[model samples]
Every structure is written in C-alpha cells, then in structure tokens.
Target: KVFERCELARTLKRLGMDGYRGISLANWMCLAKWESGYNTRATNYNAGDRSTDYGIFQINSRFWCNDGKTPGAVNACHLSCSALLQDNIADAVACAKRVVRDPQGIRAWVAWRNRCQNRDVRQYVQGCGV
Candidate 1:
C-alpha cells in the first residue's frame, strides 16, 4: 500500500507543475512521512482523549483557520479548520502552500512548523529547489 514518490511526482506534474512547484514537494514528503506517514486522515492520540489532532499534516482540527463548520473551509484567524474532513491531504497542501511559498509570511509558517529542522527544505544554494 505504499505509493512511490515517482507516482506522486507524476501527479504533481499533471497538476501544471514540474517536480518543484509551490512548496517543495520533496521536503513536504519528508515532513509527511515523519508527521503522519503520508496519510490524509492521520491523528495522534497520545493522551487517549476525544480531542482529534487530525489531518495529513496533523495540524489539529481546531487550529487552522477561523471556522469549525466544514473541516477545512473557513481560513480565518479564529476557529480554524475542523468541521468535517479538515485533515485531508488537499487541505493540508493548501494550508502549507499558502505560507510556504509566500514571501510575506514564510517566516511565520517556518517558525510554526519548526522548518529549520530540515534545512534542505529551502533553496539557498543559488536557486535550487525545496
């Protein structure tokens, strides 16, 4: 049940981009493997509670945007994505991309994700790729 990265690359390319596009899919895969093993609906019940820390990115249902009515729709500064299926892969990518590729707020996203843990996630060696 494990899909190869090449398959993922093909999908991304079909989505109107090469191997390196919006958010460095390579580094993204690394983070996903560590965070949730690339599962879209992954969660961590470390404390054995009802609180759902869900999604592929494991962003937690109650901490993405400002609205808890559709799992991943609101996108504000309050409620956050946690309505129905907010922790899916598509939403995770969307949320990550919003900050990962934006020059205005990359620092905030990096700090939040502790992106420094993976220096290879960036392209500092004369414009390479994530």
Candidate 2:
C-alpha cells in the first residue's frame, strides 16, 4: 500500500502516533516519507551488515525484526520481517512504537534525524486534518 500524505497522516494519528513519545504525527509522516515514501512493501538491504530494512518505516532486521539472515540480529520487535511488509500496518506500527521506546526515541531512525528533526515538518500533515 502506498498511502497519500494526508491518508497516512490521518492513519498514523488514529494509530496513536500523534505526539507519541513526544514525536508528532508530522514527524512520523516525515520519517515515513523519507524512509519508504509511504509504501508498505518497501525494502532495503544493507550489505555491510547483511541486514534488511522492511516495510513502510523501514524497520531493520539487524535490530528490530527477524529475517534469519542478519548476523547477530535481535528480534526486539518479536516478529518476522515479513510482517512489516503487509498492507495492514498494525504489526509494523506496533514495531515502530517499540523502536521509539529505546533511549534514542525517534532518533532510532537516522532518516528522522537527518530530515525531520528541527525541520518544519508540519507540512507533512498540514492538510491531513489530523
């Protein structure tokens, strides 16, 4: 599923992503925009770590989800990486929430830091009615 900006914003807000752990829906929108362009089936492989990033939030196999191929990987989210690729985002949203529970908070995603943090992220959800 590839969501439109406003569609994703309203969805995330309904999923309790708005102001979750001090990270606004817009920030989450910004992260998703940069991470996977709102595509649920997006995937990226890291050859260096032999890990793969899966789904809309780009949850990584090395630290969050189990792909059975990442060396020294930990399934902190306790789910198969395949779950992240589903059109239903419940599991992926749950895993993303889990990722932010760490000390890094939303900083768990470097893309958020490089693109969303301190930026005028409001535009991501300006017309989303979220």
Give the TM-scores of the predictions, in the order they appear.
0.48, 0.97
Candidate 2, position 22, lDDT? 89
Q: Name the candidate that leads on TM-score.
A: 2
Worst 10 residues of 2 by lDDT: 121-130
lDDT of each: 0.44, 0.92
lDDT of 1 by residue, 1-130 (tens): 2334555444433443333344444555555555555555555543542335455455543345443433444343233444323432345455655534445433443332574354664332113221
Clashing pairs in 2: none
Q: Give one clash count per candidate, in the order shown.
A: 8, 0
**How far off is residue 68 in model 1, in Å?**
4.6
Show pairs that collide, candidate 1: 55-87, 65-80, 66-79, 66-80, 67-80, 71-83, 71-84, 71-86
